Structure formats: C-alpha cells, structure tokens
Design a binder for this molecule. Structure first.
Ligand code: CA
Ligand code: CA
Ligand code: CA
Ligand code: CA
Ligand code: CL
Ligand code: CL
Ligand code: MG
Ligand code: MG
Lengths: 165, 165
C-alpha cells in the first residue's frame, strides 16, 4: 500500500477505460458527466456521515470502495472523451499534489456534499478536477491502492458481461 | 484584411459557438466529430480541384466561404465540448504558427483529401488540430477575416432560426 499514484498507473487506468468504452456505441459525454454525479451521490450514501439514526453508520469497506470505483470509471471515461494529453496529465498531478481542501476531516463532514454540488452544477468543472476529487477521496479515506484494485476487478467483470460470459 | 487571428478573436468565436450549442439538448460529441468531417467534404466539393470536366471549377467565393464556416462551427463546438483551456489556446497558436504542410499549393492539390481522411479516421485527432486545419485553409486560400465574417453571419441567422424569427 504505497497510497500514491504514478504516471504509469494513471495511463494504465485510462487505457483500461478506453478499451471498454470503445464497445459502447451510444457513448455520450453529457450523459457520462451526469452519471459521474449520480455515482458520486451513491458513494456518498455509503459513507453515511449524515445518517445520525444509525448505530454503525458506514457500509462495509468493500462496498464503499466498489461505489467509489464507479466514480473513477466515469471520471476516466470523461477524461478520455475529452482527450487526455500529456499536458493534461501534468496538470492533474500538480492539482492532485497541491490540493489543500480535500483532506480527511473535511471529507468526513456531511456538509461537504453542498460544496461538491456547487462544483457539479458549474459548466466549467474540468475532467482533471473530477479525477482529483476521486483520487483524493481514495488517498484520504481509503488508499489509492484499494481503489485501483476495486476498479480493475469491476472492469474485469464488465468485460465478461459485454463478452457474454 | 489582416489575415491574422488574435487571442481575443478566437475567444469571441468560442463564446459565440457556446451560446448556440447551449440551446441544443441532444448535443453529442461523437456526432459533432462526424459532422465536422461531413462538412469538410462539402467544403472540399465546392473547391472542385478534382472536377476536371468543368470549364470553371470552383464555386463562387461566397459559397466556398459559407461551407468553410460550417467546418469552423463544428470545430469550435468540439473544442468547447472538450473544454478549451488557456493552455489549449497556447498550443493552438503554436501549432497554427508553425504548421508547414498546409500551404496554398498543397491545399490546391486534389490528393490532399486522402491525407485529410488519414487524419479523420484516427481516434486521436485533437480538437486543436481540427481548428488548425480550418484556419490554415482560410489563411492560405481565402482570408481569416472572410471566414470569421461568414461564420458570424451564419450564427446570426442560426440564432434567428432557434428564436423562431
Ligand atoms: Ca455506484
Ligand atoms: Ca483534450
Ligand atoms: Ca456545409
Ligand atoms: Ca479539455
Ligand atoms: Cl429515517
Ligand atoms: Cl460526370
Ligand atoms: Mg509535485
Ligand atoms: Mg509564435
């Protein structure tokens, strides 16, 4: 568990997503952006920081990671659809390294979801920012390693589905 | 007729396209990319460098410019849909300034269309490259000024249509 993300790791993830999306003819960037937000809320719903009525709020770790991996899926798809070049990659690592406001205590505050919504309805939300958000969550609440593992598992199953196996 | 393109001119064009596309709910990046290529061939068909059987090949200048403006329309739309940032703009002006192979005699060769097709079926064709192509054609065969004029005229009519006037 390095809990770090390398250039080669990111490039591999983008390549994995690309191979799967190439098999989706109706691929629609506007729809992918909406799916990103919907999947984000589903992940947020597994964290359960607003569910005061629960004895043990928070779903099992493997469930939370699986729902987080959905956010990553659409984040990678959106990046690929917009053309993720070497200079986009550099800006991503700079933005990721120097993000100051997405740390553990902030992400554990249930009011964080209002800030996220303020980003989500802005036309100018970048594909880079969407990726920074999902990797900071992994880095801060989980590990980047488990997120990558859950996503790769999911995509293997996804290829089996589209293969009819 | 400066036959040049400034940063402010490009930003204005992108803003014009953005306002119009915001009124198109079914906006689909994959469809816009195909439309770019189809409109490209329509413009090429007005140049008529392959129509050996004509006495006066080439349609009137205003027709050629109008069809070129269609290429620009989809080129701007694709750029906007992919998120055209300040660094994309800088790379565009560098690519445009230092393009060596899209000059007048090349563009007047009817075999140029095979090279274009080799670019058009490549998944990795960038929105920047699509814009470099259309502005070099304007610069070399027409002027950038007439292209901008034809596009602005077209978009004014387009807003009148979507306004129901
Ligand atoms: Ca989900
Ligand atoms: Ca891009
Ligand atoms: Ca046309
Ligand atoms: Ca972009
Ligand atoms: Cl309740
Ligand atoms: Cl004939
Ligand atoms: Mg650094
Ligand atoms: Mg220069």
């Amino acid at each position: 568990m390095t809990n770090t993300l390398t250039t080669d790791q990111l490039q591999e993830l983008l390549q994995i997503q690309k191979e799967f999306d190439d098999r989706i003819p109706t691929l629609n960037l506007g729809d992918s952006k909406i799916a990103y937000v919907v999947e984000f809320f589903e992940w947020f719903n597994t964290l359960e920081t607003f569910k005061n009525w629960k004895k043990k709020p928070g779903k099992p770790l493997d469930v939370q990671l699986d729902e987080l991996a959905d956010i990553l899926l659409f984040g990678l798809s959106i990046a690929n659809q917009q053309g993720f070049e070497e200079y986009d990659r550099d800006l991503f690592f700079e933005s990721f390294d120097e993000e100051y406001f997405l740390d553990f205590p902030y992400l554990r505050n249930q009011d964080m979801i209002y800030d996220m919504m303020s980003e989500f309805y802005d036309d100018d939300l970048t594909s880079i920012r969407r990726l920074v958000i999902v990797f900071k969550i992994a880095e801060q609440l989980y590990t980047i390693d488990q997120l990558i593992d859950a996503y790769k598992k999911k995509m293997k199953r996804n290829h089996e589905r589209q293969d009819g196996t």
